[PDB]
Coordinates of C-alpha atoms in Angstrom, one line a residue:
Chain A
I1056 CA 248.6 -54.6 147.6
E1057 CA 248.1 -57.6 145.1
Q1058 CA 251.9 -58.3 145.4
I1059 CA 251.7 -58.3 149.7
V1060 CA 249.0 -60.8 148.9
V1061 CA 250.7 -63.4 147.8
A1062 CA 253.9 -62.6 150.0
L1063 CA 251.9 -63.2 153.5
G1064 CA 248.7 -65.1 151.8
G1065 CA 247.6 -66.8 155.5
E1066 CA 248.9 -64.0 157.6
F1067 CA 247.0 -60.9 155.5
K1068 CA 243.7 -61.2 157.4
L1069 CA 245.4 -59.2 160.5
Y1070 CA 246.3 -56.3 157.9
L1071 CA 243.1 -56.4 155.8
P1072 CA 241.0 -54.7 158.4
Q1073 CA 243.2 -51.5 158.4
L1074 CA 242.5 -51.2 154.4
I1075 CA 238.7 -52.1 154.5
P1076 CA 238.5 -48.4 155.1
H1077 CA 240.2 -47.2 151.4
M1078 CA 238.9 -49.8 149.1
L1079 CA 235.0 -48.9 150.5
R1080 CA 235.5 -45.4 149.6
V1081 CA 237.1 -46.1 146.3
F1082 CA 233.8 -48.5 145.6
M1083 CA 231.2 -45.3 146.3
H1084 CA 233.1 -42.5 144.9
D1085 CA 235.3 -43.9 142.0
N1086 CA 236.3 -40.9 139.4
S1087 CA 238.6 -43.2 137.4
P1088 CA 237.6 -43.1 133.7
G1089 CA 235.5 -46.4 133.3
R1090 CA 235.9 -47.3 136.2
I1091 CA 239.2 -48.9 136.0
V1092 CA 241.0 -48.4 139.1
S1093 CA 237.5 -50.5 140.4
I1094 CA 238.1 -53.3 138.5
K1095 CA 242.4 -53.9 139.1
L1096 CA 240.4 -53.8 142.3
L1097 CA 238.3 -56.3 142.1
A1098 CA 241.2 -58.5 140.4
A1099 CA 243.1 -58.2 143.7
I1100 CA 240.3 -59.4 145.5
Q1101 CA 240.2 -62.4 143.5
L1102 CA 243.3 -62.5 145.5
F1103 CA 242.9 -62.7 149.0
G1104 CA 240.8 -65.9 149.2
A1105 CA 240.2 -67.4 152.8
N1106 CA 241.7 -63.7 153.8
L1107 CA 237.6 -63.0 153.0
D1108 CA 236.4 -65.5 155.2
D1109 CA 235.9 -62.9 158.7
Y1110 CA 235.7 -59.7 156.2
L1111 CA 233.6 -60.6 153.3
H1112 CA 230.1 -59.7 155.1
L1113 CA 231.8 -56.4 154.0
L1114 CA 233.2 -56.1 150.5
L1115 CA 230.3 -57.5 149.5
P1116 CA 228.2 -55.0 149.1
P1117 CA 230.2 -52.5 147.4
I1118 CA 231.0 -55.5 144.6
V1119 CA 226.9 -55.8 144.7
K1120 CA 226.3 -52.5 144.0
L1121 CA 229.0 -52.2 141.6
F1122 CA 227.0 -55.2 139.3
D1123 CA 224.0 -53.8 140.0
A1124 CA 224.6 -50.3 139.1
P1125 CA 222.5 -49.4 135.4
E1126 CA 224.8 -46.8 135.1
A1127 CA 227.7 -48.4 135.9
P1128 CA 229.7 -49.7 132.2
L1129 CA 229.5 -52.9 131.3
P1130 CA 233.0 -53.9 131.4
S1131 CA 233.2 -53.3 135.3
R1132 CA 230.2 -55.1 135.6
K1133 CA 231.7 -57.9 134.1
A1134 CA 234.8 -57.3 136.3
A1135 CA 232.6 -57.6 139.8
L1136 CA 230.2 -61.1 138.4
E1137 CA 234.1 -62.4 136.9
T1138 CA 235.1 -61.8 141.3
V1139 CA 232.4 -63.1 142.8
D1140 CA 232.8 -66.3 140.9
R1141 CA 236.3 -66.9 141.3
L1142 CA 235.2 -66.4 145.1
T1143 CA 232.5 -68.7 145.2
Chain B
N387 CA 225.2 -85.1 157.1
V388 CA 228.1 -84.1 154.8
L389 CA 228.9 -87.7 153.7
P390 CA 227.4 -90.3 151.9
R391 CA 226.1 -93.3 154.1
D392 CA 228.0 -96.0 152.4
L393 CA 231.3 -93.8 152.4
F394 CA 230.5 -93.4 156.5
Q395 CA 230.4 -96.8 157.9
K396 CA 233.0 -97.4 155.5
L397 CA 235.9 -94.5 157.3
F398 CA 233.5 -93.9 160.8
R399 CA 232.5 -97.4 161.7
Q400 CA 235.5 -99.8 160.2
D401 CA 237.8 -99.3 162.9
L402 CA 238.2 -96.8 166.0
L403 CA 241.2 -96.0 164.5
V404 CA 240.6 -94.8 161.3
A405 CA 237.6 -93.3 162.7
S406 CA 239.2 -91.1 165.2
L407 CA 241.9 -89.5 162.3
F408 CA 239.0 -88.5 160.0
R409 CA 238.1 -87.3 162.8
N410 CA 240.4 -85.3 163.7
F411 CA 240.9 -84.5 160.0
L412 CA 237.6 -82.6 159.1
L413 CA 239.0 -80.2 162.1
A414 CA 243.1 -80.2 159.7
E415 CA 240.7 -79.3 157.1
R416 CA 239.2 -76.4 158.8
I417 CA 242.5 -74.6 160.6
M418 CA 244.8 -75.4 157.8
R419 CA 242.5 -73.3 155.1
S420 CA 242.5 -70.4 157.2
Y421 CA 246.0 -70.2 156.1
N422 CA 246.5 -71.3 152.4
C423 CA 246.6 -75.0 152.8
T424 CA 244.4 -78.1 152.2
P425 CA 244.4 -81.7 153.2
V426 CA 243.7 -84.2 151.0
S427 CA 242.0 -87.4 151.9
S428 CA 242.7 -90.2 149.1
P429 CA 238.1 -91.1 148.4
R430 CA 237.8 -87.7 148.1
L431 CA 235.4 -85.9 150.9
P432 CA 232.7 -83.0 149.9
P433 CA 234.1 -79.2 151.7
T434 CA 233.0 -79.7 155.5

């Protein structure tokens, strides 16, 4: 995904809505040790850039639930916070 | 609403053609932004 985003750039927003359902399922149920697959997906969202304009309302609640969940581990919470920093 | 009063009268009031270019520049900034492009101006404007 990260390589498709840098390749297409502005044209990625045509295809992003197809991928959104899978990304939202990743946050809901991530059993990855220390949720490192979540941290990777945050690093991808940073690359998305101004593509996320029309879809930020979809991605942001999962990210917000991620860094506010106390059960979640600190690395994954820092990764979510740093992502919001970049997207700002 | 976005620019400081001083810089507004400099660009948007002095002469028509410059004012027209900057008026249309704001539209360029919006459109090109949606294709990973950022227009650049010499008197730097805050993002509108």
